[PDB]
Design a protein around this nucleic acid. Structure first.
Lengths: 274, 276
DNA sequence: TTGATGGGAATTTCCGATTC
DNA sequence: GAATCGGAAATTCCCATCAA
């Protein structure tokens, strides 16, 4: 048989906690989790019922999928990975109290060496590239689910599968984009209105303010000098498609990161006839 | 004789460099420095001419002037203090090479003990109190000048009374940083007040900041909540009502960031109240 | 060019408010 | 309570500038 991910983890939102912040790094959310009810990364073993073992490991975002320096902590976790005892019942396979613990940049080598020492290299990658020579990333991880089926004395290894990449909300370039507050949400259809936009930490060299409407797009209009300490952007509204507005049109304004073409939740802006 | 400070240090502006930032902590500027010419901490030895030695160490701000964990670095500095030289003439005694290196919060004890082991306790504070010192005193230091004058057979040991300078503040710690308004939404409003202002500024503490409007015999505060202080560098408030709600012509007042703790004030910005 | 300076941002660590 | 979380403080790091 094989393994399948039913509820992928959420990708943007949570901070990778360090070891010094102690305890557990909370618990990775389900992709569709909300305040009404919270979902958790959950899997099912297609075409099988019975006992077994599930082991979860952090792996790189990119194809070779090396084991990742960061490590999981929480329920049923030890030595930096998850390895729990599977029960026939299942409803299906929930993983709530998983938590991503990031390691200091200096402890990266000793961590990878610690991982492959325990024989965790799910995709048996050649050694010359696993020990690395380049970067790594450290802001993006992927869950790796390894399922072992009965034979113990749980050794029948199903194919290991990866989740969607998970992004550190604390890193400026992989963080979730968020408009916190604006001085005003309406302006002349001619544009040129100065807007003070308060947001979560961005990088001045990598941020734009993207206005859109049905078959229309326009950018902010500012310089890097206009990005105050990563959390305020002072820009001027762009001209709208129709400079002769007779009634207000509702457009959608949002922060956009060119690097990964990511977008904040839209904020309603209203072009006025002027 | 005795020693007196001719040019006090500047108090606010420079950040205490860490040991890891390497290099040198720049050079402590004189109080009266400008862009044309920079002044340096300078002293004179009242009523005396001859040889000697000057030793400078950092000590706490508060009445009992305990030795301070942080340390000086630069010309004629070693082991965390400044010592020796200036004997013959060159009578203005100035210290331009000075640099404040701060020590990590863990290694504070090791610093104090390393200092008093070198026998530096200018104001001979008891040992029972040196056992302390962990607090907000990591952000404020004082220069302590000890002057030793020649004595019997020619040895710089006499020791004049120690004098302290004005406190020097870490520009990097939020509670001791220099206040600065960087850019504002608009600088004119109804004399009735209630106009929303977006103020972009240097790192402040939401629990210890107000927006202080003043004019000839008049003061008024910002009006905002801590929830309105975005990520320590943005204040969204509403202007207060002016003294005269019946303005017939515009009146220009000065708006500025104010820190209640040490009543410090930013450079004022002009704001003109308008006839409603 | 070489090194010191200045000032912003990245990285780690802490801590009080909320919530479990 | 104990745990979680969002914000701030504490250290490092790196680059753009100015002195060497």
């Amino acid at each position: 048989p094989y393994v399948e991910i039913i509820e992928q983890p959420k990708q943007r939102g949570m901070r990778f906690r360090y070891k010094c912040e102690g305890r557990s790094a909370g618990s990775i959310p389900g992709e569709r989790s909300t305040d009404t009810t919270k979902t958790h990364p959950t899997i099912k073993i297609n075409g099988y019922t019975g006992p077994g073992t599930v082991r979860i490991s952090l792996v790189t975002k990119d194809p070779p999928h090396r084991p990742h320096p960061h490590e999981l902590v929480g329920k049923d976790c030890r030595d930096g990975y998850y390895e729990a005892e599977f029960g026939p019942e299942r409803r299906p396979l929930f993983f709530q109290n998983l938590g991503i613990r990031c390691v200091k940049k200096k402890e990266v080598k000793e961590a990878i060496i610690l991982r492959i020492s325990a024989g965790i290299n799910p995709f048996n990658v050649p050694e010359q590239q696993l020990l690395d020579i380049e970067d790594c990333d450290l802001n993006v991880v992927r869950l790796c689910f390894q399922v072992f089926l009965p034979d113990e004395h749980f050794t029948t290894a199903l194919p290991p599968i990866v989740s969607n990449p998970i992004y550190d909300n604390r890193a400026p370039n992989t963080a979730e984009l968020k408009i916190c507050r604006v001085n005003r949400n309406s302006g002349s259809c001619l544009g040129g209105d100065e807007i003070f936009l308060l947001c979560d930490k961005v990088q001045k060299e990598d941020i734009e303010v993207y206005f859109t409407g049905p078959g229309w797009e326009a950018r902010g209009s500012f310089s890097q000098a206009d990005v105050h300490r990563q959390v305020a952007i002072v820009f001027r509204t762009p001209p709208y498609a129709d400079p002769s507005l007779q009634a207000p049109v509702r457009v959608s304004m949002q922060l956009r990161r060119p690097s990964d073409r990511e977008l904040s939740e839209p904020m309603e802006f209203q072009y006025l006839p002027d």
